[PDB]
């Protein structure tokens, strides 16, 4: 829906441009400024909602504990689950940040500045990262005490 | 409503002069003769009326639409160029007698 809204906005802008009006580029620039501020506001709202969901649809990440040659093993281990969580929150960010810019390079092709356009500061991103690290830390803490049982085989009768 | 002294633009043409011209036109066929100076003045006013009324309606319309523009300040920057040519035309025309 963001993409169609932006497409209609750009279509209206192009309709103005083809009419050969006066003093367009700065008007387009300030429209981009306002729309990027609004995008930053919506992005902070969505990011904080995603963070509180962690603490917005979220994929369920799963990994198993197995044993091979009588060695406790993880499939996948915890760090890969961390990477999947990071990828999911990257995709959640890209839901908004992949939106194209408005114009009469890569950054100029589609808008990537909403992080600096953050009205509340990096705290929301910081608290999201803090939630991720807390979750992974608790997971590995549970694993450590649970994985400790593997030392029994190491130790013959 | 505003403390400042507004320099409202008008047209140097009394709308009631044509009423005198039509009065003279009626009186000629009525058989009453008016002084020749009045005849010349009425004829000049009648022949110059369409230009004056066109001028006043055009300036009134331009004013109305420019106050509509400034009512929405988000549009004045785009509309500035057209207002610039309009102001240039007004500047050219004002110096004329």
């Amino acid at each position: 829906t963001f993409s169609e809204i932006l497409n209609r906005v750009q279509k209206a802008v192009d309709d103005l441009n083809l009419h050969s009006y006066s003093n367009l580029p700065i008007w387009v620039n300030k429209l981009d400024m306002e729309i990027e501020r609004i995008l930053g506001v919506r992005l902070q709202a969505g990011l904080r909602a995603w963070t509180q969901v962690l603490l917005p649809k979220i994929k369920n990440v799963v990994h198993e504990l197995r044993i091979t040659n009588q060695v406790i093993y993880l499939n996948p281990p915890i760090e890969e689950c961390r990477y999947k969580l990071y990828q999911e929150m990257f995709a959640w960010k890209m839901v908004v940040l992949s939106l194209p810019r408005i114009q009469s390079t890569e950054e100029e092709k589609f808008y990537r500045n909403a992080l600096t356009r953050m009205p509340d500061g990096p705290v929301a991103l910081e608290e999201s990262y803090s939630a991720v690290m807390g979750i992974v830390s608790e997971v590995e803490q549970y694993v450590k005490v649970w994985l400790q049982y593997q030392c029994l085989w190491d130790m013959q009768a | 409503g505003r403390t400042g002294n507004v320099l409202k633009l008008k047209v140097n043409f009394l709308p009631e002069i044509i009423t005198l011209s039509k009065e003279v036109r009626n009186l000629k066929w009525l058989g009453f003769r008016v002084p020749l100076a009045i005849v010349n003045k009425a004829h000049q006013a009648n022949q110059l009326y369409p230009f004056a009324i066109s001028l006043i309606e055009s300036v009134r319309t331009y004013e109305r639409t420019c106050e509509k523009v400034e009512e929405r300040n988000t549009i004045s920057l785009l509309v500035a160029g057209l207002k610039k040519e309009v102001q240039a035309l007004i500047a050219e025309g004002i110096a004329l007698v």
């Binding site: - | 320099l7 920057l77 160029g81 207002k83």
Partner: peptide, 28 residues
Amino acid sequence: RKLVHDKELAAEDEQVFLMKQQSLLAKQ
């Protein structure tokens, strides 16, 4: 050396133009 747009269209508020041309009419 990517060219940046120069000075945009100016407003020149109606009141200033009106007073300038009032002065010009007075002096003419």
